[PDB]
Design a protein around this ligand. Structure first.
Ligand code: AKG
Ligand code: AKG
Ligand code: CO
Ligand code: CO
Ligand code: NA
Ligand code: NA
Lengths: 387, 386
């Protein structure tokens, strides 16, 4: 009787004009473990380690890897040269301040492009016969770099706290000069997704070149902001392995990939070697001496777990085979010692030998001897082993 | 200046939009679900004493609601509800139930302030009558029963972003006609996106007149961003979990949420919640479910308040507001006591000459097993308080 209502139906429901601008299954990662990652509290990468991380990334499938400025130190100039000489498939970028010395050094090292950042004293606003200009000094740099055949991206810092009048006018000016990309950076970690959406949609209307986005994760928006940026027309996203960067970091590589996988499995699965992801995180985890968080996306202990029983299959939007794993683990009890190793190793496709099981089981004991295990102890103890 | 410049892009009197009036970003309630959804975490096995501490600490922290596992799930579960409903918490106490008169009867018996009801496909139908949606007579009895005993009702559906919109919105409307405190939306699977969430919540806000609760899993990194957009669109209640703990990688984490809402409105959050108690709260749960605080955990993880030094403008979170003393400026790999000292002073622990020793030996006995993690510093210090 009184427990019903007329059914709410809508009043031909194909794609919206806005959908055509979306880059959600056609974008590039710019991998920044070797620039932004160097600002992580425990990053002290030496050349060899930089080289490995670079090879692994190129092999994993990213389109670009960004390096710390060559001008920053002499060790950087060298490492830049070193990495530019490996023959990687992906393009190699370096980050510079907007200056003629920084650029000369940058192209000397052999990069494929410079990510240029501009300072307030390098552009002005004035009425003339109101008008906004890049100064003559600055503009020469862009032209220089262009004339040496190198790609130029142009950015402003703290993009979400700048005057919009300033920012947009500047990006338009730079677009008239002609560059490959303009970048947007949430340095401070304060941007919200719909706010990111409006800004990129507008930028996409203002300029004609490509658009790059860089988001910090202070407030848990880095992955969401990158997503909305892609929806609005952004063509490139900076990521970092495990997100490592300044403070709690930027858009994490794996997290981004998890989100884009759900949106288009075929595209992500074929472009990137997803079963290589654990390996990639472990190599960085080792160098910066951190543990893979228990709740880390895809690769953390509990990402692929279902509670069995008293607090409990088609709620599995991520398929473990696509990322090198074998199954969701159905957890009904607190596994201890060997039991816990066996479960994770099996999930992870490690074909452990008789002796290895022992070496591990013994070590896990010597650990609990010091204090109680954490469930991240299981992943740590297994870090050295491969599928 | 030269040739290559442009005319300044300027807009064409600007104030708040009508949409802004519906936002709940500085006026919402947390429903804290460490004791329901958190029980589904791979390593969660809370006994009664531990459930009691967690409830007391959440109440003190300032959350408005705490959610408990269904009293029909098990006997221990029934008893723990009774136990917690008797503690005299300030916050309201809710339990989660399948929509059945038996489950409802025992929920009222235990003493809850409210039942979060989830309905199953067999309990509502579409039919033409002189295109109509109905909640079934025996399902509806449950709602009225609960209301007749003076207990709050929230009604929801599972896997809301994957349900047919026709069914879902029709059901919520019918429910609203019957009359309930709240309806709920849940992204059970972790696939929803913030603009999707906004659209759906705004529409729901237009369909029903009651309150709106949201539940978001974090499989794809959207849980916090979904919570926020849900709030902008009119949602009134967000489910959280300490450290996000739940099924798989969990739901919107309490700490993370509070960080996001803090930036949006410092005064509101700082005054409503005891932010300097977040760490102790996380550590209590970390201890029980035997995990370590992620190094990049929001606010409280080792690296949240670090600046690299080397080869105050950029500090949207103020360390003093969360009981800490400063951003640490890192130029070196601190080792042994150096690293303890740094973090301890950052966390405002005034350690004894003796306690420093106990810690230094222990961090050694730890690195003498395998090379250290930055997570180890927070781990050895877990037992110490400001
Ligand atoms: O040039 C950029 O956009 C990156 C600089 C940066 O790390 C930041 O703004 O956080
Ligand atoms: O009652 C609800 O809506 C939440 C149930 C749940 O945990 C979920 O949908 O993931
Ligand atoms: Co940055
Ligand atoms: Co859930
Ligand atoms: Na355009
Ligand atoms: Na309404």
């Amino acid at each position: 009787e009184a427990n019903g209502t007329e059914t709410i139906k809508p009043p031909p429901y194909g794609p919206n004009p806005s959908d055509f601008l979306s880059r959600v299954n056609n974008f590039s990662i710019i991998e920044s473990t070797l620039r932004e990652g160097e600002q992580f509290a425990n990053a002290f990468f030496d050349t060899e380690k930089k080289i490995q991380i670079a090879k692994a990334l190129d092999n994993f499938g990213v389109d670009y890897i960004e390096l710390t400025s060559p001008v920053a130190s002499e060790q950087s100039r060298q490492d830049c040269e070193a990495i530019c000489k490996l023959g990687l498939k992906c393009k190699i970028l370096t980050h510079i301040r907007c200056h003629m010395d920084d650029a000369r050094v940058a192209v000397e090292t052999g990069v494929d492009g410079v990510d240029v950042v501009i300072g307030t004293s390098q552009y002005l606003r004035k009425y003339s016969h109101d008008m906004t200009y890049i100064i003559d000094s600055a503009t020469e740099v862009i032209n220089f770099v262009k004339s040496k055949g190198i790609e130029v991206r142009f950015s402003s810092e703290d993009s979400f706290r700048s005057d919009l009048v300033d920012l947009l006018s500047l990006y338009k000016a730079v677009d008239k000069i002609g560059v490959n990309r303009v970048g947007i950076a949430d340095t401070v970690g304060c941007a919200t997704p719909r706010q990111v959406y409006d800004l990129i949609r507008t930028l996409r209307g203002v300029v004609s070149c490509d658009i790059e986005c860089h988001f910090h994760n202070d407030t848990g928006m880095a992955i969401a902001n990158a997503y909305c940026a892609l929806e609005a027309g952004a063509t490139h996203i900076d990521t970092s392995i495990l997100g490592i960067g300044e403070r709690n970091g930027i858009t994490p590589l794996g997290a981004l990939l998890a989100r884009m996988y759900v949106t288009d499995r075929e595209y992500i699965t074929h472009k990137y070697k997803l079963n290589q992801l654990r390996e990639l995180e472990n190599l960085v985890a080792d160098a910066v001496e951190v543990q893979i968080p228990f709740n880390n996306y895809i690769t953390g202990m509990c990402a692929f777990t279902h509670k069995a029983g008293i607090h409990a299959s088609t709620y599995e939007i991520l398929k473990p085979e696509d990322f090198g794993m074998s199954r969701y683990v159905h957890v009904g009890s607190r596994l201890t010692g060997w039991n816990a190793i066996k479960s994770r190793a099996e999930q992870l496709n490690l074909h452990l030998t008789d002796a290895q099981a022992k070496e591990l089981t013994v070590r896990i004991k010597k650990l609990a001897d010091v204090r109680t295990l954490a469930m991240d102890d299981v992943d740590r103890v297994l870090r050295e082993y491969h599928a």
